[PDB]
Amino acid sequence: SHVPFLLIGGGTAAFAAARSIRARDPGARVLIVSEDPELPYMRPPLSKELWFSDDPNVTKTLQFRQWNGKERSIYFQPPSFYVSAQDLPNIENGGVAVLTGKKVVHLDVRGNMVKLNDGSQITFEKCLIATGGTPRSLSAIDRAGAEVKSRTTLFRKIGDFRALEKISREVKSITVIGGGFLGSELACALGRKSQASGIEVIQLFPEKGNMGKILPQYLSNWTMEKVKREGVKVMPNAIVQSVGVSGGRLLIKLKDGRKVETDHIVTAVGLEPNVELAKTGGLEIDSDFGGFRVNAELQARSNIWVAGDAACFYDIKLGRRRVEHHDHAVVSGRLAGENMTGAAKPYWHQSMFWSDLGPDVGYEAIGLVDSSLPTVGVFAKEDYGKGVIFYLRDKVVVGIVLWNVFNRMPIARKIIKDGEQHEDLNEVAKLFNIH
Amino acid sequence: PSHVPFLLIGGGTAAFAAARSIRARDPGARVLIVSEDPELPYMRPPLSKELWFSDDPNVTKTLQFRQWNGKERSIYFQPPSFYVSAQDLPNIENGGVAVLTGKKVVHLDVRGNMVKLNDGSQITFEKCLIATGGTPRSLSAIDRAGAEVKSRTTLFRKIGDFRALEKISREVKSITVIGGGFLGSELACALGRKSQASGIEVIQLFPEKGNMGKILPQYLSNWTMEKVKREGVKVMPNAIVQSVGVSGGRLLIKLKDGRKVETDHIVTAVGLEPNVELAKTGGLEIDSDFGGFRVNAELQARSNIWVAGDAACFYDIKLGRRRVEHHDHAVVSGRLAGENMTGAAKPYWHQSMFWSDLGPDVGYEAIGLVDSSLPTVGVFAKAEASEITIPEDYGKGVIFYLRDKVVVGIVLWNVFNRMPIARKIIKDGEQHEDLNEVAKLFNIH
Ligand SMILES: Cc1cc2nc3c(=O)[nH]c(=O)nc-3n(C[C@H](O)[C@H](O)[C@H](O)COP(=O)(O)OP(=O)(O)OC[C@H]3O[C@@H](n4cnc5c(N)ncnc54)[C@H](O)[C@@H]3O)c2cc1C
Ligand SMILES: Cc1cc2nc3c(=O)[nH]c(=O)nc-3n(C[C@H](O)[C@H](O)[C@H](O)COP(=O)(O)OP(=O)(O)OC[C@H]3O[C@@H](n4cnc5c(N)ncnc54)[C@H](O)[C@@H]3O)c2cc1C
Ligand SMILES: NC(=O)c1ccc[n+]([C@@H]2O[C@H](COP(=O)([O-])OP(=O)(O)OC[C@H]3O[C@@H](n4cnc5c(N)ncnc54)[C@H](O)[C@@H]3O)[C@@H](O)[C@H]2O)c1
Ligand SMILES: NC(=O)c1ccc[n+]([C@@H]2O[C@H](COP(=O)([O-])OP(=O)(O)OC[C@H]3O[C@@H](n4cnc5c(N)ncnc54)[C@H](O)[C@@H]3O)[C@@H](O)[C@H]2O)c1
């Protein structure tokens, strides 16, 4: 069996890639081999607006109100927008098929071939590894019993949302382990639901505050406070030593000694780029950033690009990196799809991300947004309600967070791009309508 | 604003081998080598070896040397006639290889597929190879030294350096070689060979315990140094230069250890700096570990940019990311880059190797990860890295460089015609129960 564009993984980058492949190559035959039985869907509403919707039937429909009151599905497109795997090689105008429930287990890079779990083989011409990541689990939950594992869940998928929101109607306490994006958003989502249902929502993580890897300390702190205000028990500086079952419920034991009892743990502890295919593939992984080491164009080897969460790419302006964001999956998937159809475009228009942690934390971020970098923050009118945060390297702005600053990403994009050695970052903040 | 389908930046071995690879695979390919060096692509090995062993009084003029068979050879890869001019290249039937000598690419516009040269001219390309090699590192002790001393201290890389140094070897009472690596050792041996007739004082000083300390296990390095001494070299191992000045009309090297060397001339053979200036304007990734441009298994940097030779930091699928600065590697990587520039999509796979000679008792070959930082097992004939030997005569043997219970590198020590065995051993990743049984494969028994 053969397909021109084999997108390994049925996610956002694969869909964006399938879309940009199809935008750039309107006849393209794209087989998404998706080990997931679900058709591609955006993950963000699984931790945001799928929770915000009225209608108990939201869980079945998987539909959500957008920023304007217009509703839409989590699925990138109706199932009827896809052609079947069997029809894919034959259907006129090509299309996008998803072989759902099938996993690529061997990447014969030399042979441009994948072997699936069912022993079946598919060759390809262009391959996007858009395998994303699997939620890292906690060492403590792996070494724990069959009982605790049956009530600890990872969160990535529709089934995780469905399990979790069902659980959110069934149990009285859900603990989110992880202080990054997903922890913080699931915290807030569950927080919002707890307004009407009264469920306990605990969020816990090793850093000083939410988004610790991302936000400078002062701002990570201001944010944690906003997440708390969403109805979340936020527990920073938390390292899990072990997890057991106790009194029907789960008992999480922290290194510092604190202990969380909860009915259900969601561990959002970062992502392991799914690089299993590298070994048989002879593909280089980045030992620093993880993921498949790819260049500015998302390319690993001649016919293999990697996009989305699994891609460790070179940013010409910002250096080598890996980014795990929907818009990056979209941007890099789109880019890889463009590059898979020959754009030879380096990553350049920066992917951004946004996060909402309640109504007072709406931010957008671009570039090297890493709390390990020097930063300069300038804020309106400590009150960090509105401001702009500059991540700096070699006397130059390398990352920007637009903090409740709306409609200014263009300006941020421009500062990142220009590598100006700013005489006065206070004058630069004024560009973001921060005085 | 000219254009060339294949642009190779740098006019050395890698560029040459890429040129001939591109040409082999894409016959009729038009390939422009841009070379800041006024000289055409030449091989550097004889500059430290056979051009000194020549007793031809004209060898500095001719740059010719006799090979193994006694057949004479130029250090140039091919004669100047075998290249097309840069003007003729866009047009010449079935393309070929042009060299823009004395021209430095000073800007690489990767987006616009373009380079800008030092005279301000621009060249677009379809596929580009960066093969800029490296430039000898200088000793900062010389850099900070005065005008007089600097003008009596030479780097050694190029034909010009051979000529200057060989001239100096007939004028002065004493030359000091600084550096104990490949080039220092070979030049010291070269000069020592010379001193048997000239009575010139030949001194070699380097920080390592013995010659070739970065690649040979110590016992072998030491044995090698004794062989170098016996070449008529005052070998001063363990030497780090503190300052160089002028005293009594002669150079005065002051070593950190307090030794002084009064000498008339200094050559500093202190390693190579990969030439990566174009990464900057190019927005090309440099490898901060190995130095050089960072490229994949296929030696590819960007859609249309590859890198090869001393300047290429590449991914070895079986052995990992590396950069090698060896003639045969410049050959192997240039060859491969060339192939990939022409669609081959092939990973580095066939391993390059190297060799060195330090007088008549020291001739060796090496393949894979040959690095005195690796564990080694050496097996020799009767007559902090682990350095094992299998039962002071290190006249002949095989040295296995190990990683992950697998041979990842091999040195064949006065063992000739066994590289393919070494190579298979490297390739097969067998976990050998008995390296003495493996050494039997090398006629060590
Ligand atoms: C709940 C949630 C919410 C988010 N919200 C936001 C947000 O608001 N803003 C933001 O910027 N980012 C957000 N993100 C991050 C964003 O969704 C990810 O960056 C994005 O999903 C990356 O997509 P991907 O296609 O690279 O990987 P994935 O979406 O992980 O898709 C990869 C797919 O490939 C499959 N796969 C793996 N290996 C194989 C194999 N060998 N064979 C076949 N299939 C395989 C996996 O099962 C998976 O289905 C969110 C993520 C989650 C999980
Ligand atoms: C005296 C000597 C002896 C050696 N003996 C041995 C040996 O016995 N065995 C062995 O294995 N190896 C030996 N080597 C090492 C071997 O010669 C090198 O590995 C090989 O020369 C590397 O080839 P290259 O093409 O990568 O780089 P180089 O040969 O350095 O060629 C690069 C060329 O590109 C030019 N260049 C740089 N930047 C630009 C630019 N921007 N624009 C245009 N041109 C540019 C440089 O000036 C240079 O001329 C020896 C080296 C020397 C110096
Ligand atoms: N708006 C958004 O950008 C958004 C929203 C939801 C999800 N996501 C994405 O979803 C993916 C998964 O999200 P995530 O939040 O799990 O990852 P993340 O990288 O955002 O955060 C990882 C967090 O896990 C925690 N962690 C790491 N090691 C730990 C350890 N061993 N023990 C306990 N905690 C540990 C830390 O708190 C760390 O900040 C990420 O790729 C993320 O980018 C993004
Ligand atoms: N047979 C061969 O493979 C061969 C022969 C000659 C030259 N070469 C090549 O030529 C290039 C240059 O040769 P090289 O011998 O200069 O490089 P090298 O890397 O082989 O040796 C560097 C040596 O320089 C000396 N050194 C480094 N820093 C020093 C310091 N600051 N002070 C004093 N000494 C210092 C050390 O002895 C070290 O071994 C290399 O790329 C090398 O591979 C190879």
Q: What is the DSSP letter of B80?
A: G
3-class DSSP state for residue A313?
A: strand
State the Cα–Cα distance between residues A10 and A52, nearest whole angstrom: 25
Residues A200 and A151 in one domain: yes
What is the CA(A206)–ligand 1 centre distance, in A? 23
User: Measured between CB atoms, does A229 come within 8 Å of chain B?
Assistant: no
AA letter at B416: F
Contacts for A71 with CB less than 8 Å, ≥ 6 apart:
A63, A64, A65
CA of A320 to nearest chain B CA: how many angstroms apart? 8
- For A72, the enclosing helix (H) or strand (E) is strand A71-73
Last residue of a domain, one of B306, B333, B350: B350
Cα-based torsion angle of the residue sequence B207, B212, B217, B220 in order, rounded to the nearest 10 degrees: -110
Residue nearest to atom 20 of ligand 3 (CA): A180
Let me know: does B438 contact B432? Beta carbons within 8 Å. yes
What is the CA(A164)–ligand 3 centre distance, in A? 17
* CA nearest to B257, candidates B281, B238, B275, B271: B238
Q: Which ligand has an atom closest to residue B160 CA?
A: 2
CB–CB contact B297 A302 (8 Å): no
| Count of structural domains, chain A | 3
* CA nearest to A326, candidates A52, A46, A87, A57: A46
Residues A22 and A94 in one domain: yes
Residues A125 and A243 in one domain: no
Closest atom of ligand 3 to A179 CA is: 37
User: Measured between CB atoms, does B250 come within 8 Å of chain A?
Assistant: no
3-class DSSP state for residue B58?
A: coil
Burial code (b: 16+ CB inside 10 Å, e: under 16) for B350-385 equals ebbbbbbbbbebbebbbbbbbbbebbbbbbbbeeee
Q: How is residue A186 written in tokens?
A: 């699931």
* Opening angle at CA B156, ends B152 and B162, nearest 5: 85
The structure was resolved experimentally with: X-ray
Let me know: does A268 contact A176? Beta carbons within 8 Å. yes
Q: Which ligand has an atom closest to residue A361 CA?
A: 3
Last residue of a domain, one of A301, A332, A349: A349
Last residue of a domain, one of B324, B350, B376: B350
State the Cα–Cα distance between residues A162 and B252, nearest whole angstrom: 81
Let me know: does A34 contact A100? Beta carbons within 8 Å. yes
Burial code (b: 16+ CB inside 10 Å, e: under 16) for B201-226 equals bbbbbbbbebbbbebbbebbbbbbbb
State the Cα–Cα distance between residues A152 and B232, nearest whole angstrom: 75
Long-range contacts of B62-70 (CB under 8 A, 24+ apart): B63/B159, B63/B162
Question: Which of A:276-305 have CB within 8 Å of B?
Answer: 282, 284, 293, 295-297, 299-303
First to last CA, chain A: 61
- For A165, the enclosing helix (H) or strand (E) is helix A158-170
Q: What is the DSSP letter of B284?
A: P
Residue nearest to atom 8 of ligand 1 (CA): A44
Let me know: does B10 contact B275? Beta carbons within 8 Å. yes
- Which CATH number covers residue B66? 3.50.50.60
What is the CA(B90)–ligand 4 centre distance, in A? 39
Residues with Cβ within 6 A of ligand 4?
A: B 48, 139, 178-184, 186, 206-208, 213-214, 240-241, 269-272, 310, 325-326, 354-356
CA distances to A22, A184, B100, B327 from B43, rounded to whole Å, are 50, 61, 18, 8
Question: Which of B:315-334 have CB within 8 Å of A?
Answer: 315, 317-318, 321
What is the CA(B231)–ligand 4 centre distance, in A? 19
Residues A369 and A390 in one domain: yes
* CA nearest to A76, candidates A53, A48, A96: A96
Q: How is residue A94 written in tokens?
A: 């090509």
For ligand 1, whether the C-beta of A132 sits within 6 Å is yes
Residues A357 and A434 in one domain: yes
CB–CB contact B304 A346 (8 Å): no
* CA nearest to A26, candidates A78, A116, A97, A93: A93
- For A170, the enclosing helix (H) or strand (E) is helix A158-170
Partner residue facing A297 (CB), from B297, B302, B340: B302
Mutation test of ligand 4: which of B51, B182, B255, B332 has the most ligand atoms closer than 8 Å to its C-beta? B182
Contacts for B424 with CB less than 8 Å, ≥ 6 apart:
none
B33 strand-pairing partners: B8, B99
Residues A286 and A326 in one domain: yes
Residues B145 and B224 in one domain: yes
Q: Which ligand has an atom closest to residue B134 CA?
A: 2
Residues A182 and A276 in one domain: no
Partner residue facing B296 (CB), from A284, A296, A320: A284
Residues A47 and A161 in one domain: yes
What is the CA(A187)–ligand 3 centre distance, in A? 12
What is the CA(B272)–ligand 2 centre distance, in A? 9
Residue A43, marked binder: yes
* Opening angle at CA A269, ends A268 and A273, nearest 5: 105
- For A333, the enclosing helix (H) or strand (E) is helix A326-340
Residues B120 and B30 in one domain: yes
C-alpha A89, offset from chain centre = 31
Residue B10, marked binder: yes
Indicate the resolution in Å.
2.2
Structural domain boundaries enclosing A311 = 1-41+80-135+271-349
Residues A50 and A155 in one domain: yes
For ligand 1, whether the C-beta of A223 sits within 6 Å is no
Residue nearest to atom 41 of ligand 4 (CA): B325
Phi, psi of A395 (to 5 degrees): 60, 20
CA of B201 to nearest chain A CA: how many angstroms apart? 49
Residues in B closer than 8 angstroms to A300, CB to CB, are: 296
State the Cα–Cα distance between residues B388 and B370, nearest whole angstrom: 15
B64 strand-pairing partners: B74
* CA nearest to A95, candidates A7, A227, A225: A7
- Which CATH number covers residue A432? 3.30.390.30
Residue nearest to atom 16 of ligand 1 (CA): A326
Contacts for A157 with CB less than 8 Å, ≥ 6 apart:
A36, A38, A46
Q: How is residue B153 written in tokens?
A: 């201290």
DSSP states along A201-268:
EEEE-SSSSTTTTTS-HHHHHHHHHHHHTTT-EEE-S--EEEEEEETTEEEEEETTS-EEEESEEEE-
Residues B373 and B428 in one domain: yes
Breaks (C-N over 2.5 A) in chain A follow: 381
Residues with Cβ within 6 A of ligand 2?
A: B 9-15, 34-37, 44-45, 47-48, 104-105, 131-134, 157, 183, 275, 277-278, 309-311, 325-328, 330, 354-356
Q: How is residue B125 written in tokens?
A: 């390309």
State the Cα–Cα distance between residues A322 and A310, nearest whole angstrom: 8
